[PDB]
Amino acid sequence: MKEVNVRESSQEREQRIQQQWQKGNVFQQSVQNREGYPSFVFYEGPPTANGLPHVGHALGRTIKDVVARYKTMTGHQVIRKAGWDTHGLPVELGVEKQLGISGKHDIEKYGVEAFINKCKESVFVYEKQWRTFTEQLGYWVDMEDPYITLENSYIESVWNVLGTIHDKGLLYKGHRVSPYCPSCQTSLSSHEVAQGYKDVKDLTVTVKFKVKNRDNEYFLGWTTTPWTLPSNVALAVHEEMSYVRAEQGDSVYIVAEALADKVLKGEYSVLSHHKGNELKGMSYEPPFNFVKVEKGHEVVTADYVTDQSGTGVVHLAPAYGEDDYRVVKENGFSFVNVVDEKGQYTSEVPPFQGRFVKDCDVDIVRYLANQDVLYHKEKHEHSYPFCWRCDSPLLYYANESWFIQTTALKEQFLKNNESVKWYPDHIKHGRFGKFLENMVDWNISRKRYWGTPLNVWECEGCQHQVAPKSIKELQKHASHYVDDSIELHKPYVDDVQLTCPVCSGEMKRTPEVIDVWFDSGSMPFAQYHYPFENSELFQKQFPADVIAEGIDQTRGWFYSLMAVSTLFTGKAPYKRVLSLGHVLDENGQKMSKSKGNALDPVDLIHTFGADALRWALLADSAPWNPKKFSERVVQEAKSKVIDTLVNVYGFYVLYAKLDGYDPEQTYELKKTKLDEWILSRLHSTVKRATVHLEDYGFTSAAREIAVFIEELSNWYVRRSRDRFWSEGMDGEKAAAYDTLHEVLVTLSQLLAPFTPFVADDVHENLTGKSVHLADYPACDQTKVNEKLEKEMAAVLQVVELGRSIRNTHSLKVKQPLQSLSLVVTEEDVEWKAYRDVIKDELNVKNFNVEQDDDKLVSYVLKLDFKQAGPKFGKQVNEVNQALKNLSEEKGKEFVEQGKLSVTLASGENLTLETEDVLVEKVPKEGFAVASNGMYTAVLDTALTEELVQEGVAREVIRAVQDYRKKLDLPVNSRINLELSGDEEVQKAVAKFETLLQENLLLHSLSVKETIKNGETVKVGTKQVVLRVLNQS
Ligand SMILES: CC[C@H](C)[C@H](N)C(=O)NS(=O)(=O)NC[C@H]1O[C@@H](n2cnc3c(N)ncnc32)[C@H](O)[C@@H]1O
Ligand SMILES: [Zn+2]
Ligand SMILES: [Zn+2]
């Protein structure tokens, strides 16, 4: 083993370990060495290369590393291939800002290829930043040969999946009302929409729709979206609902019967009743006539019309509502649209053309009043969908899109999810399962530029569709030569046309790219270029035994993985999911670069070490709920846990070298009880840490290890230092080194998944072998001693109570005290075995175990004025004083009898009730008490001259020992000590001459009045002059 003497920062140690890992190919070796062992299949969720990693990203990569390292150590091969997510809106928008452009028209002007090249350059920059962060965090994952979603082979596998889905009839094009982002100018999927809901307040209005062929009669139409009123095509009523013609003032209003009293306020008179199907076909005047409707402006039956809210007459705009689209289509009414692709009014609405529709709500209300059609308005507090990338409010907008028909396999989705073990369990049928139950088809087409091109070609002539699964299939169908090096991106694939197998017409590729979530969802198949390559490796690497990503992937990678695999293979792509709560700042606020509360994990790693950051991320709280985090928690992990291990390790190395201990040599071992206890704690920790890790309880396993590390340092090492400090390799010293060597090797093995850097530094130096090539240690039950653990835990509690008393009464432990008495209710612990430990640790001359406190306490008596006030009147203070004057035995009698008589000054005898007296139990004179209920410790705090003088002699002994170290004197030489001090020091040194001589290797001791050029030292509150000569 090598020394740990030269001061090394945490960063320097981890850099040294990192280089050791590189030179030895330890990561690669930890995989290859498990060839033929059972597989544990792990999929890396690919980080989006559109920004810098923050400390929240360190949680998931820490947990994935713990799992992979642990499963490797317990006898599994864990292949770890990194991945980078590089397509889609999350990349495009950031690049647009870098370029100072915005929107699809600006991208066309900039140039599609030039824009895409900028995207490629940006993702490459971010990949390197993420790679460096991952390496310094110690998350072993192959970033030399990662999968990358922009790579041609990866895209080809995605094409093969999409082509296979198309073969089944599950990829189709349709004109549907879909959630739509007016800024990004594209439809969005249902999982993307679920990620962007925000509470808003807007206006729902009731508008009068004047009935044609009548007078003073208006329908009361209702809508939550005033901006859709110019596009009105029909009014919807329920067929079997009852409506009333109600007269108010000079007008008559048609409204639902159950809502009339709410809608019509002040005064009305119901004239007639009508069913919903009776009102069918009645024409009316639209609130706006800017747009011309060919067929419409009538009343139709819709089954979804409710009488619970609104008026029972619902304004329908077919282009901006799925129900509205369906009902208008059924009744053959003309479809109309008044909005461009940017969410702005077209020329068909003159007064508002070129304005965002949701910003016209206030002006629409005023226009409604001016036409005298407005009848009511109210505020609507509800959730509304916003774009998960650009924060623009969404619209529901009729649009031609491509869909993956996920609903066709909904039953298979639920069955696959039912096979998955979720952490936390509630996600399975909660956040994730509920999303499966409300499944709609997956809108995958994005009218964008940077992404996986949707590989569907349509014949211009007969609309036949061809979906090439590969470059070879693309080449086979193309009407022109297609080079083998064709890049599977826009615009290169848009220059490829096919010959239609049906009519020989020209086939053109649909222009869209696909949802970025499909790319990552395809990684089980695309990361190995399946089925074109690595068919056998893929089969061994499917399904995954676990994945671990943030909770937002329930609307992300968790869903897209499940959907792609279910549509493609029918099978669940994973057996087990760790759904991780998000890291927040120290205030509980979400982490963001804009908010400035996103800590840099690289700075934390540089300052405190990755081992400390990882430990704090694992041990401070559980990973399943939102997590408050701070630099302070990392600092505490470094000083309390990481530094403590390093110091114990450095202590062992220094004294093992000095004493020439050799773990390969065989010694006669005199194992002590403290050796047995720490070994029992070691293997009990091994057992309980393994049990938690087997159930992915990282926090509980970490906390268990931290407890053991505290016991190892604060108790085992601290109390065993003499056996390392002593000279000569006796049986006890050899046992100490043997015990500590086993603890350090096994503990570092335990810690290897958690704190990989320091664990290897200890283990490799002690054994010559990397800890990460080792097996996870097994619990040796023969070294577990449950009784010994139980007693030492009781001893620690007693020592803690004793220290508490000493601190409370300002009695420093260096000052010996006469006795500690322990009151125990039961003879559970063999206290005789720990007498020397308790007396040493508390510095008491005597340790006595008592069954009760009768010899240690007394009773004083007072009067309960709230209970005995009226009974004695003006004599209450005389009786209360009478109780306080009673002797110790009188109080002892009262607590046993419960009845008491007090004789007042006049001789008047009075009787005291049990509840009239307040009883106080006090320790006997000179004693002090602390109790935890189970144990009552009674300490004699009374000081004698002999006790004080012994304390002075102890202080003299320590002062001399400190002065010897300052002079670099040999530990073997005997010294001539000269000492000067006042009479109290002189008397103490004289009286305890034997004690001084036993603890100091003194050739002679001279007490002088004055010392020439002496060293003044501070012994207690006194100053003592020392001077050391050497025997000549
Ligand atoms: C599995 C990854 C997806 C396919 C996608 N590329 C993506 O979300 N990429 S990411 O880089 O934005 N996310 C990386 C991982 O970090 C999690 N995460 C993101 N933000 C936080 C946060 N504040 N606290 C904790 N974890 C967080 C993501 O869920 C993902 O696991
Ligand atoms: Zn958007
Ligand atoms: Zn054709």
Author numbering: 1 to 1032
Quoted from the paper:
Mupirocin, a clinically used natural antibiotic, inhibits isoleucyl-tRNA synthetase (IleRS), an enzyme that links isoleucine to its tRNAIle for protein synthesis. Two IleRSs, mupirocin-sensitive IleRS1 and resistant IleRS2, coexist in bacteria. The amino acid is first activated by ATP to form an aminoacyl-adenylate (AA-AMP) intermediate, followed by the transfer of the aminoacyl moiety to the tRNA.
To understand how IleRS2, but not IleRS1, accommodates the non-canonical motif, we used X-ray crystallography to determine the structures of a pair of IleRS enzymes from the same organism. Apart from wild-type PmIleRS1 and PmIleRS2, both of which harbor the canonical HXGH motif, we also structurally characterized their corresponding GXHH mutants, all in complex with a non-hydrolyzable analog of the isoleucyl-adenylate reaction intermediate, Ile-AMS. While the KMSKS loop is known to be flexible and to change its conformation during the reaction, we also found that the HXGH motif in IleRS2 is displaced towards the KMSKS loop. The latter affects repositioning of the first and the fourth histidine of the HXGH motif by 2.3 and 2.4 Å, respectively, and the Gly α-carbon by 1.7 Å relative to the analogous positions in IleRS1 (insets). The displacement (shift) of the HIGH motif in IleRS2 is of utmost importance for the accommodation of the non-canonical A/GXHH motif and emergence of hyper-resistance.
